[PDB]
Amino acid sequence: LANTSAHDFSYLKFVYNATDTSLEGSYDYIVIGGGTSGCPLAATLSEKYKVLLLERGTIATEYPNTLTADGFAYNLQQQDDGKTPVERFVSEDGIDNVRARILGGTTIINAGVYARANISFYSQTGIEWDLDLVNKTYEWVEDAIVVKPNNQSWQSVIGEGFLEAGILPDNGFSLDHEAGTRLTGSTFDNNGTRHAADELLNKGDPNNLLVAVQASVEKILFSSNLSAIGVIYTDSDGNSHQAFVRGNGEVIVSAGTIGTPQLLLLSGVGPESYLSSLNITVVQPNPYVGQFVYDNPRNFINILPPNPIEASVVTVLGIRSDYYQVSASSLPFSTPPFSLFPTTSYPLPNSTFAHIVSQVPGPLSHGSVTLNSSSDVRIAPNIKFNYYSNSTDLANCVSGMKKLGDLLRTKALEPYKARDVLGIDGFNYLGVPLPDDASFETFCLDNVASYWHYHGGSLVGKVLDDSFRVMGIKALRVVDASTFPYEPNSHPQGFYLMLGRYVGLQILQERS
Ligand SMILES: Cc1cc2nc3c(=O)[nH]c(=O)nc-3n(C[C@H](O)[C@H](O)[C@H](O)COP(=O)(O)OP(=O)(O)OC[C@H]3O[C@@H](n4cnc5c(N)ncnc54)[C@H](O)[C@@H]3O)c2cc1C
Ligand SMILES: *[C@@H]1O[C@H](CO)[C@@H](O[C@@H]2O[C@H](CO)[C@@H](O)[C@H](O)[C@H]2NC(C)=O)[C@H](O)[C@H]1NC(C)=O
Ligand SMILES: *[C@@H]1O[C@H](CO)[C@@H](O)[C@H](O)[C@H]1NC(C)=O
Ligand SMILES: *[C@@H]1O[C@H](CO)[C@@H](O)[C@H](O)[C@H]1NC(C)=O
Ligand SMILES: *[C@@H]1O[C@H](CO)[C@@H](O)[C@H](O)[C@H]1NC(C)=O
Ligand SMILES: *[C@@H]1O[C@H](CO)[C@@H](O)[C@H](O)[C@H]1NC(C)=O
Ligand SMILES: *[C@@H]1O[C@H](CO)[C@@H](O)[C@H](O)[C@H]1NC(C)=O
Ligand SMILES: CC1(C)OCc2cc(C=O)ccc2O1
Numbered sequence: 001l002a003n004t005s006a007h008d009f010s011y012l013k014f015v016y017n018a019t020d021t022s023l024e025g026s027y028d029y030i031v032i033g034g035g036t037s038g039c040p041l042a043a044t045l046s047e048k049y050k051v052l053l054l055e056r057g058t059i060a061t062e063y064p065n066t067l068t069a070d071g072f073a074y075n076l077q078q079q080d081d082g083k084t085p086v087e088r089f090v091s092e093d094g095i096d097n098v099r100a101r102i103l104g105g106t107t108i109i110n111a112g113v114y115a116r117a118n119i120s121f122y123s124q125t126g127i128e129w130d131l132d133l134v135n136k137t138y139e140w141v142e143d144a145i146v147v148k149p150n151n152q153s154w155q156s157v158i159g160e161g162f163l164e165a166g167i168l169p170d171n172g173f174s175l176d177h178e179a180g181t182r183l184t185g186s187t188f189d190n191n192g193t194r195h196a197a198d199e200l201l202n203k204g205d206p207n208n209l210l211v212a213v214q215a216s217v218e219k220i221l222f223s224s225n226l227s228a229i230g231v232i233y234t235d236s237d238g239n240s241h242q243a244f245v246r247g248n249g250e251v252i253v254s255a256g257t258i259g260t261p262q263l264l265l266l267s268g269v270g271p272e273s274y275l276s277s278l279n280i281t282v283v284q285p286n287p288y289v290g291q292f293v294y295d296n297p298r299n300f301i302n303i304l305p306p307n308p309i310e311a312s313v314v315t316v317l318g319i320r321s322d323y324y325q326v327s328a329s330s331l332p333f334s335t336p337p338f339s340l341f342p343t344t345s346y347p348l349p350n351s352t353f354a355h356i357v358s359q360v361p362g363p364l365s366h367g368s369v370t371l372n373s374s375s376d377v378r379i380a381p382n383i384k385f386n387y388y389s390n391s392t393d394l395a396n397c398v399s400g401m402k403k404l405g406d407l408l409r410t411k412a413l414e415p416y417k418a419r420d421v422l423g424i425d426g427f428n429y430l431g432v433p434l435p436d437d438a439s440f441e442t443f444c445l446d447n448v449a450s451y452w453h454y455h456g457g458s459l460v461g462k463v464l465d466d467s468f469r470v471m472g473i474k475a476l477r478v479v480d481a482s483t484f485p486y487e488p489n490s491h492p493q494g495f496y497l498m499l500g501r502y503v504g505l506q507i508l509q510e511r512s
Contacts, residue, residue, distance in 0.1 A: 002147050004189045007060070007067050011201035011211070015059060015103070018215035018235040024242055027052045027210075028249040029507075030231055032217045032263065035105020036493055037480040037500035038254030039197040040141070044504025046209035052243050053201075054215040054233050056259075056377075057085060057102035060198060066108045069192040069313050073330070075109050076337030082378075085109055088338050089258075091295070092367075092384035096339040097450045099258055103213055104198030106256070107187065107493055110452070112194065113314050113326070114146045114185035117488035117495045118177040125484070127466045134502060138175075141497045144203065145195035146185040148173055152312040154329035154354065159183070161412035162318035162325065165403060177489035181318050187493070188313055197497060215241075218377045220251060220267035220476065222283050228476035248511055250475045252468075253458075253482075254500070260482040261290035261369040261457035262381040269470065278374045284472045288462035290369035292485050295385035297360040298451040299397050299444055301404060302430035305416040308352045317490055318407075323400035324359040324490035325407070341431075342449040349430045354416065356407065358400030359451045362486050364390035369457050387448050397444035398437060405434050453492055458482035467510070468503050479503045 016023055027050045031042040034055030042053035063085045065071030065078075076098065080088040085102035086109055100106040116138055122129045149155075162181040163170055171182035187195045201211065214236040221230040221242070228251040230244035245251055253260045264270060268283035270290065275282050309329045318325040332349045340355075367384035388394045407413060408424040417426035424434065432447050434440075458478045463470060468483065470476040481496055488495040 001142055001185070002145055002189065002195060004147070004191045004193070007193055007195065008199045008202050009061060011198065011204070012059065014206050014209055015211040015213055018054070018212040018233060018241060019237055019239070021241065023052065023210060023212050026244045026246040028246065030054065030243055030245055030251045032231065032251070032253045033105065033255035033259055033480065034103040034198070034211060035100060035254060035256060035480065036107050036197050036496040039104060040200040040497055040500030041252060041254060041479055041504045042209060043200050043204035044501045045507060046204035048508055049208060049249070051204070051209050053209065053211045054217050054231065055103045055211065055213050056216045057100070058083065058213050059103050060085070060108050060196070063102070066102065067194050069112065069188040069194065072111065072313070073333060073337045076340060077333065077335045086338070087380070089380050089383065092382060093387055095342045095385070095387065095448065095450055096344070097454070098339045098452065099256060103211065104196040107196035107497070108194070108198065110493060111314055112186045112188040113491040114175065114187055114494045115177050115317070115489045115491045116175045121488045125460065127460065133505060134498065137498045137502045137505070138494070140501060141200070141494070142175065142185065145187050145199055146175070147189050149183060149186045149315040150190045152315065153310050154312040154327065155314070155316040157412055158327040159316040161407045161410045162316070164410035164412050165406040167318040167320065167325070167403070175494070177319065179319055179321065181316065183315055184317050184491070186313060186315055200497070216377050217255070217263060218266065220263065220269070225474065226284060226472065227474040245475060250477055250507065252477045252479055254480045257293060257454045257457050257481045258369060258381060258383060260478050260480055262371065263377060264289045264458065265371050266375070266377060269473070278371065280374055284470070286463055286471065288459060290457050292366050292459050292462060293368050293383060293385065293454065293456045294363055294366050294485060295387065295454040296363050296451040296487055297387055297393065297397060298357050298449040299401060299447060300355055300357040300449065301433055302349065303354045303356065303416055304349065304351055304418070304428040304430055305354070306418045306428070309354060309416070311352070319490060320403070322361065322396045323403060324361060325357060325400065325403065327354050327356040329354050339450055339452070347431055353430055356404055358397070358404055359453070359490060360393045360396045360400065363393045365393050366456065366485070385454070388445055394441055394444055398440045401434060401440050401443060408434070453487060455481040455487065455492070456485050459485050467506060477503065477507070
């Protein structure tokens with residue numbers, strides 16, 4: 001595990017403005033998106049080869065509130081001016097959401113929770129994983145940026161509560177996704193400093209790795225034996241740039257669940273009928289690009305204790321097969337953190353509150369990503385998740401919401417009631433309190449938010465082979481959250497950080 005230490009920006013010595021035309025030319029690898037998977041991938045490939053990492057966002061030093069636990073709410077509260085580290089969007093379902101626009105990607109804006117994948121996930125995928133390597137790669141990430149969190153009074157309350165509510169066994173401190181109650185790792189250190197995927201660039205070879213920031217990759221370039229050969233990207237002034245791969249090199253798309261399918265569709269990789277209807281020339285027909293896009297539901301209640309509670313970052317997890325629960329305690333605010341609540345018309349708290357949540361696993365419900373613009377990558381694509389279109393997800397939210405009921409009934413939570421009455425109506429609620437089964441179904445459907453753990457759109461077995469290659473195209477891979485249809489665990493940053501380096505190692509091995 002990592003120590004308490006300042007955020008390591010040493011890698012800025014090889015970070016350049018995309019306006020610099022001397023970045024243009026040939027590389028062994030081009031990685032698109034300096035995010036959760038993309039940074040460790042680029043750092044790994046740079047051990048042996050010349051790598052260009054292209055990131056549309058700027059550097060995290062420009063937005064200091066990204067570098068502390070205390071800053072979490074600020075980045076969501078801040079207006080999206082097209083330059084900010086948080087990009088706001090609204091799914092076609094009507095649910096407010098965010099994605100990262102910064103070097104380090106969503107690890108620079110997220111809630112810091114670190115877990116390893118459910119050990120059953122690997123065999124469920126049917127990919128021939130090198131499981132020893134997976135574990136060495138987890139340790140490489142964890143050594144760099146993960147800590148054992150210190151005690152936080154709210155998280156200890158919630159852990160006592162989960163155990164009293166029957167979420168057993170007590171797993172103590174563990175990074176593993178396993179049934180029961182545990183303290184998990186965090187990418188916020190014990191001084192509250194955020195550590196993130198951008199610090200994994202410090203593991204790259206500074207003679208081999210170049211990073212362009214404010215680089216908007218607009219198109220993947222192909223050969224006239226179809227190969228990816230390069231990219232077109234534009235800089236912050238709007239001028240265009242080209243970079244290419246050479247010899248046995250490859251372009252990897254690491255632009256996230258939203259950005260990867262968007263760039264593939266803009267490049268003519270996607271469903272023939274759909275692309276044809278936009279007069280986009282088809283380079284590689286594939287009916288599944290931007291299909292099987294998922295967003296795990298977040299359902300929640302908010303309690304307002306009659307005495308102040310101390311704000312906390314989530315470290316204590318309550319895990320069952322059918323639901324994953326946590327709680328954060330928060331200061332009040334008069335500017336809402338965008339997407340914490342599903343719409344902007346949610347009532348504001350004006351005292352300290354506990355946000356107590358359950359996450360639907362999978363989920364089984366899915367939607368898609370489609371282009372809004374057929375040319376401009378800076379225009380966000382359309383995204384729809386179809387929350388609770390699958391009855392199994394609704395069934396699982398019902399079970400989760402019943403367990404949050406059990407949690408509000410524990411001795412652990414009894415001190416946070418406004419009235420010493422027998423029932424959970426003894427709490428004061430911000431928004432809709434918990435309510436047979438139909439009332440819980442209505443509550444699940446009506447009060448859903450994003451968990452922010454959206455995934456899919458470029459699935460292994462649909463768009464990619466078991467080596468993350470785009471089927472039908474040489475020298476093109478995708479490595480990020482677009483790649484799997486089901487969550488590897490409650491909190492997937494750990495899996496995607498691991499995946500970046502792991503796939504980089506598989507690329508270096510395939511080539512040796
Ligand atoms: C608010 C929030 C809180 C979360 N909290 C947690 C948590 O506590 N723990 C946890 O495990 N998970 C959490 N998650 C989820 C997790 O952080 C993400 O699922 C994961 O980081 C996604 O990694 P990725 O590489 O797929 O995408 P990203 O990390 O978003 O990386 C993609 C990168 O590509 C860039 N990009 C996009 N398109 C282009 C383009 N055309 N050209 C150039 N660059 C481009 C983006 O700017 C971005 O930097 C959270 C998510 C959010 C939004
Ligand atoms: C870890 O993932 C595994 C496999 O995806 C889950 O085990 C499955 O769970 C369902 C519901 O309990 C069972 O009906 C399946 O048959 C199980 N499959 C296998 C291969 O064991 C497990 O639930 C996940 N664990 C947690 C705690 O989320
Ligand atoms: C890149 O250069 C332009 C000036 O041409 C400037 O406006 C922009 O802020 C720079 N971006 C970064 C990330 O330095
Ligand atoms: C990988 O580490 C996990 C704990 O995260 C352990 O359960 C598992 O047995 C390890 N697998 C191998 C192949 O060593
Ligand atoms: C595609 O181009 C043809 C002209 O070849 C035109 O008839 C049609 O409307 C165009 N469709 C779109 C959506 O641009
Ligand atoms: C683009 O997104 C807007 C939201 O601004 C949506 O309402 C509009 O219909 C979209 N256009 C296309 C072509 O998808
Ligand atoms: C839900 O998902 C399962 C697994 O994909 C699928 O078998 C089924 O068709 C879906 N169920 C409903 C209610 O649509
Ligand atoms: C569980 C979850 C979403 O984690 C993070 C979080 C942060 C805040 C502060 O704005 C408030 C509530 C909250 O809850």
